[PDB]
Amino acid sequence: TKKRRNNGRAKKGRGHVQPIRCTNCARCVPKDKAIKKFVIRNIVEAAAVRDISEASVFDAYVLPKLYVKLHYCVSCAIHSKVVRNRSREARKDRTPPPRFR
Amino acid sequence: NYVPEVSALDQEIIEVDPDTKEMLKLLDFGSLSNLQVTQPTVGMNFKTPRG
């Protein structure tokens, strides 16, 4: 019984895809199958923003951002709840979740 | 059953595109005086930007 038409990966018209290492557990997982996440955040948190803006020597100094690319295997993605199981009909929907308010 | 005094369809001037005028002409209706030909939009950009 096939669960998915694409076999859970994004490989089409090619034979081999080089593996990467899970950020959490360092497992080898093919790059097309891995769960990718691009994280752009602030170096300083919300309270730290107000605590730092007063102690800075510059005027309206913009705090730098952190850019990180994260790769997860299926087990770590499910365990960390960045990915959840869906219904048989809801599996097909591949629209990203509505994070934009 | 509210009825206005005049019809909203009644217009002294109705604007049409040249293609609509040609379609009317093919049906021997190119003699209408209410028609006014408007310049079509120069740029053909009617699709949502894919992304």
Binding site: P64 | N45, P49
Partner: protein, 88 residues
């Protein structure tokens, strides 16, 4: 380079960009082209210069990606190298 009685005198040694600038320049649906040259100045200083550029999406573009073909990338890289060579 030299000390002159409580006055250290420095000289140019290099140039670079900040980490967040480079991280924010790289995006997912475009092409990146990089080049490097080794050029000697008239007074003996040998330099290695690196250049980076990205393809730009058009104002009225409907296609999601903006990819340059390989020959276009090679032409752009050669244009980078010759300009960087002729200015040093």
């Amino acid at each position: 380079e030299d000390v002159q009685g409580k006055n250290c005198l420095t000289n140019f040694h290099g140039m670079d960009l900040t980490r967040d600038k480079m991280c924010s320049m790289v995006k997912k649906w475009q092409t990146m082209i990089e080049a490097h040259v080794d050029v000697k100045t008239t007074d003996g200083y040998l330099l290695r210069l690196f250049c980076v550029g990205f393809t730009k999406k058009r104002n009225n573009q409907i296609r999601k990606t903006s990819y340059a073909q390989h020959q276009q990338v090679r032409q752009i890289r050669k244009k980078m190298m010759e300009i960087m060579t002729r200015e040093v």
